[PDB]
Each structure stands twice: as structure tokens, then as C-alpha cells.
Design an enzyme around this catalytic site. Structure first.
Site, PDB file in Angstrom:
ATOM      1  N   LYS A 128      66.917  40.307 -47.015  1.00 25.92           N
ATOM      2  CA  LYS A 128      67.491  38.981 -46.835  1.00 25.92           C
ATOM      3  C   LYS A 128      67.721  38.328 -48.186  1.00 25.92           C
ATOM      4  CE  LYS A 128      65.398  34.982 -45.324  1.00 25.92           C
ATOM      5  NZ  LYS A 128      64.308  35.720 -46.019  1.00 25.92           N
ATOM      6  N   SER A 171      51.741  33.392 -44.304  1.00 24.39           N
ATOM      7  CA  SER A 171      51.306  32.074 -44.742  1.00 24.39           C
ATOM      8  C   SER A 171      52.240  31.066 -44.095  1.00 24.39           C
ATOM      9  CB  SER A 171      51.273  31.973 -46.265  1.00 24.39           C
ATOM     10  OG  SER A 171      52.539  32.257 -46.824  1.00 24.39           O
ATOM     11  N   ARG A 224      69.966  34.965 -50.227  1.00 25.07           N
ATOM     12  CA  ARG A 224      70.783  33.773 -50.109  1.00 25.07           C
ATOM     13  C   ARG A 224      71.910  33.880 -51.128  1.00 25.07           C
ATOM     14  NH1 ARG A 224      66.497  29.988 -47.063  1.00 25.07           N
ATOM     15  NH2 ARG A 224      66.130  31.826 -45.739  1.00 25.07           N
ATOM     16  N   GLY A 251      28.548  15.792 -53.126  1.00 26.80           N
ATOM     17  CA  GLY A 251      29.552  16.800 -52.821  1.00 26.80           C
ATOM     18  C   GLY A 251      29.341  18.156 -53.468  1.00 26.80           C
TER      19      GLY A 251
END
Ligand code: ADP
Ligand code: ADP
Lengths: 286, 284
Positions: free
Chosen positions: A184, A214, A186, A35
Site C-alpha cells: 500500500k 497498535s 500513497r 508516586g
């Protein structure tokens, strides 16, 4: 000059090389059975200004960059210049809790120690530039985005949060358009959104611009709100289209089109930043 | 002192911590949605000698090591000491063709820049030790292997090739056994093998020892040569058991048993090197 094109940036590096009339030098690359990564650059790089083009976000991309920086030491080069169109780990640019890494600091220190310069396109938070011993330039995709959208009917350019404002201000001005941003927050399990200024978007065509897509949550949410308020068309653009976890589909639930750059190559990569990178390369010379 | 146990070395690191009567400090670790690695060490490391225990072979292990070296900088530590039981990229310790990396050079330079010392168990080729600015120690699994085989019937200790000789000589001396090595070369697609010295293995019990088992080709070929010359039992040991896909099966085609250390943890890790690492730590 020699342009080295790493696996993550083949498309963009090829466009850049073609524009500068030079070879996009690719490595021979493979994994050993255990690897470990193998790379080889058999071209003679001696005496040239080298430009290594490759993103630095995935574990494999980091290994590719580090081993390339070792491989090129086999030659007496005039200079070594890293261009990471998308710079990984830029979101971890400080410690947010005790005992966290400043990932962008250590990685930038490593790259700086083996190069003469670093550049990236639209880094997330320019703080990271200050972690480099060598000049670390932050290129901008603004002009490429403008060149695409000058041929689209747009009324407002929009930032999906109260950051990234400078970018939206610049793009909107070059397009001759007004702009606004969405805040925005909350507040006890309930979301509250404000437009600043409080632009009436009924019947209007909106271009939403961000640096990175993303997970796409904020953009998807803002797009739905805007569509709800009567927006006639919504175009979503970002410099770096990572598209994690079905984000493009979440966004396309309410937006009409997505157009990103070739910093991260995908089917949505319709806006090339090759010219901006070419101007930078010409400046560094070779 | 503080022992940091990375993902790849939890087993060995826990054994070491227990022996030293200390906490094996593990990170909180996760991947962000975009795939980037996140680590956090919330324990106060200020004023302690830190020993980071983790392998450096896989892409993820390298990132875990690098980010750990950044994370610990949040604390004014007495010292930072890397112990990589299995040291990755040790096989690429020079350029073998133009334009290749010297991978163990640049990686060792990086690690050396952010630590006060480095250590590993049975590195492949000590050349790599010279690439470090800080003292880079090569620890040995020999005593652990000897301790295990003292209770096994063995006639000869054997190296699969002419490079693992010093190890086989030491192990065999400590077991009170004779030893030999196998020279295998290809000559026009056909294989020639020579035992040195030319020991008669008919009816003999053999312990073959190597540093690393990857594909197992080398060890499997030798085991086969020896079985066909009449060896009655073949034990295969190595320090670092990587065991890529077909290897275990290939080896057990002709060998009876496999026993490796816990530098790389697998079903065959029957031999622990915790004592050897504890010695190093006690002395550093
Ligand atoms: N690749 C990543 N993906 C998502 N979040 C990340 C990533 N890297 C770091 N983070 C986290 O993102 C948070 C910081 O983002 P943000 O709220 O924008 O703060 P800042 O304004 O300082 O950038 C931190 O908690 C950090 O650990
Ligand atoms: N992880 C790895 N797995 C297998 N082979 C590797 C690995 N890393 C490097 N190599 C290769 O192993 C070769 C060196 O092995 P070898 O022929 O025994 O010479 P040396 O005596 O220097 O080890 C080189 O071609 C090198 O590129």
C-alpha cells in the site's frame, strides 16, 4: 530455577511457571504517596537461575523492570535472565532525525548491564538485538500461531505490508498454504494497493498476520479492500495486541475475527506463547 | 555552554538560562499513540558543555531523563552534566527489608554511566552520592532561604525532627536567630514531643524548615504542637514541595504561610534556587 512474574505478564508468566512446575514469584508492589514505586521480593533467590518476565513498553513497566533488577541483587543468584514478551521502544531503533534518542539502544544497554541474558518474542527489527552486551534472543510465535490455525479453514496467509514477509512465509509453509502480501502506497492523496502475487481472493478465506497491532490502520484498510474484492472470511492475527484508539473495532468493521497472543494480555489473547518461552528457559537451564 | 530544560524544570531552568544569558533548550516532546515517549533536540550541541536540568521523581521524569541522555549522544559534546533539582528515590537509599531495591543506587548508576557529573539540591541522605561513578554534588538552598527570610519577623528557626538539624543550624546562624528541633515519638499509640532545647514558644514567631513536604503529616503535626503551646506565627518552608493531595490543607490548619523553592514548581514556590545552581555551573 525461579520465575519472577511482573504485573504486565501475570497471565503468561503463570502459564510458564505452571508448565515448568515452579512458583510464579510476584512482588509485593505499591506506590508511595508521592508516586514513587515500591517493590519487594521476600523469597530467597540465592543460588537460583532467575527468569524475570515482564513487558517493557509503559513508563511503569520500565520502572518495574529496573527496580526488580536492583531488588534481586540482594541475593547471590546463579544468573539473571530477562524475558520481556513484548519489548518496548523497538520501533525507535535508530535516529530518524538529528537529536532523537535511539531509545531501544539506551534501554537495552541498561537491561544488559544488569542481566546475563535478554529475550523477547518477535521483536520489531532485530537491529536492537545488537545493542545488547549479553545474548539477546528473539523468540518466535510462529509455531503457536500455526497450532491455532491448523484447525481453521484458511486458503492464504497474508502480510498487510511488504515487510513481515519471512513470518508469513514460515507460517504459511507450516500450514501447507500459499501466501501473498499487500503493498500500500500513497501517491498524491490517493491510495494505491497491489497484491503480490496478484492473488484472486474472491470466495477465499484469508489469514492476515502482523507483528504488532497498535493503531491498526494498515490492517483495517487492507481488510476492507480484501472484503471488497470478495474474500469470504478474514482472520486477523498479530503477536502483540496493543489495540490503541479503537483499532480492534476498526479492524472488525471488515475482518471476521481477531486472535493475538498473550505477550500483551487482552480479551483477544487466544494463542499462548508459553511453550516457546518454556523451551528457551529450559535451554538456559535450571 | 548549553542548558537543556526538561518538562519538570521549565521555570527554574529558564531562570538559570536567563541569569547565564543562554537559551533554555527544550525538547520537542510527545507521546506516540501507544504511549511511548518521543523526544528531539534539533539544536547542534556539538562541542558544548551540556547541563541537563530536570527532576527524576516520576516515572515520566525518569524516562525523559534517560531518553535525553540518548538523544544528546547524537552530538560530540564537550561534557554532559545532569542537574536534578529534586532527585527522586533518594528515600530508598538502602534495603530496609530483604528483596527490596536500592532504588537510588541503580538509578544513580544509570545516570552516572551516561554523564560526566551529577548534581541535585538538598538530597535526602548523602549516602546516595556514593553510588555514582562520576562526581555527584549536593547543592544547598540555605542561602536562598536566608535571603527570603531576612525580611521576615522570626524568633526561632525550627526543625520538625532530629534529622534536619544541620540545615536549621546554618539557616539560623545566617539569620542571626536561635534555633531548636522537635523530637516526636509514639509510645503505645500516644504521642510524646520534646523541644530541644526546651524553648518557650509562647508568643513567639517560628520558622519551621524541612527538606521535603510530601503528605505534610510531619510538618502539620509539629505546627499543631507549637500553635497549641502559644506560638503567635508559624511559617513553614521546605526545599521540595511535592504536596500530595491533602497536604496543603493539613499544614495551613495551624501554620500561617508556606514558602518552598522552585525545585518542584507549585503555587507555593516563592523562593528560587537559581543562584545556587548558577554557581555550580560557573564552577563546573
Ligand atoms: N512507539 C512508536 N509508535 C509509533 N511510531 C514510532 C514509535 N517509536 C518510534 N516510532 C517512529 O516510527 C518511525 C519508523 O518506522 P518505520 O517507518 O517502520 O521505519 P523502519 O523501517 O526503520 O522501522 C520513526 O519515525 C520513529 O520515530
Ligand atoms: N518515596 C518515598 N516515600 C515515602 N517513603 C519512602 C519512599 N521511598 C522509600 N521510602 C521508605 O522510607 C523509609 C525510610 O525512612 P526512615 O525510617 O526515616 O529511615 P531513613 O533514616 O533511612 O530515611 C523506608 O522504609 C523506605 O522504604
Amino acid at each position: 530455577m525461579k520465575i519472577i512474574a511482573l504485573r504486565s505478564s501475570l497471565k503468561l508468566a503463570a502459564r510458564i511457571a505452571e508448565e515448568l512446575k515452579t512458583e510464579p514469584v510476584m512482588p509485593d508492589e505499591r506506590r508511595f504517596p508521592d508516586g514513587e514505586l515500591y517493590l519487594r521480593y521476600d523469597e530467597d533467590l540465592t543460588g537460583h537461575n532467575i527468569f524475570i518476565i515482564g513487558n517493557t513498553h509503559s513508563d511503569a513497566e520500565v520502572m518495574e523492570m529496573i527496580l526488580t533488577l536492583s531488588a534481586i541483587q540482594d541475593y547471590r543468584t546463579k544468573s539473571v535472565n530477562i524475558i520481556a514478551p513484548y519489548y518496548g521502544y523497538a520501533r525507535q531503533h535508530q535516529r530518524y532525525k538529528n537529536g532523537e534518542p535511539i531509545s531501544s539502544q539506551i534501554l537495552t544497554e541498561i537491561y544488559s548491564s544488569y542481566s546475563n541474558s535478554i529475550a523477547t518474542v518477535d521483536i520489531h527489527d532485530e537491529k536492537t538485538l545488537s545493542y545488547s552486551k549479553v545474548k539477546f534472543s528473539d523468540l518466535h510465535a510462529n509455531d503457536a500461531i500455526v497450532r491455532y490455525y491448523k484447525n481453521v479453514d484458511v486458503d492464504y496467509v497474508v502480510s498487510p505490508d511488504d515487510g513481515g514477509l519471512a513470518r508469513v512465509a514460515d507460517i504459511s509453509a507450516k500450514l501447507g498454504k500459499k501466501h501473498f502480501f499487500i503493498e500500500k502506497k500513497r501517491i498524491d492523496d490517493r491510495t494505491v494497493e497491489m497484491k503480490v502475487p496478484n492473488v484472486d481472493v474472491n470466495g477465499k478465506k484469508l489469514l492476515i498476520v502482523d507483528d504488532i497491532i497498535s493503531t491498526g490502520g494498515t490492517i483495517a484498510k487492507s481488510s476492507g479492500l480484501l472484503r471488497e474484492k470478495g474474500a469470504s472470511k478474514i482472520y486477523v492475527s498479530a503477536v502483540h495486541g496493543l489495540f490503541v484508539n479503537g483499532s480492534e473495532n476498526k479492524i472488525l468493521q471488515n475482518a471476521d475475527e481477531i486472535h493475538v497472543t498473550d505477550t500483551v494480555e487482552s480479551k483477544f489473547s487466544d494463542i499462548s506463547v508459553y511453550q516457546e518461552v518454556c523451551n528457551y528457559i529450559r535451554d538456559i537451564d535450571a
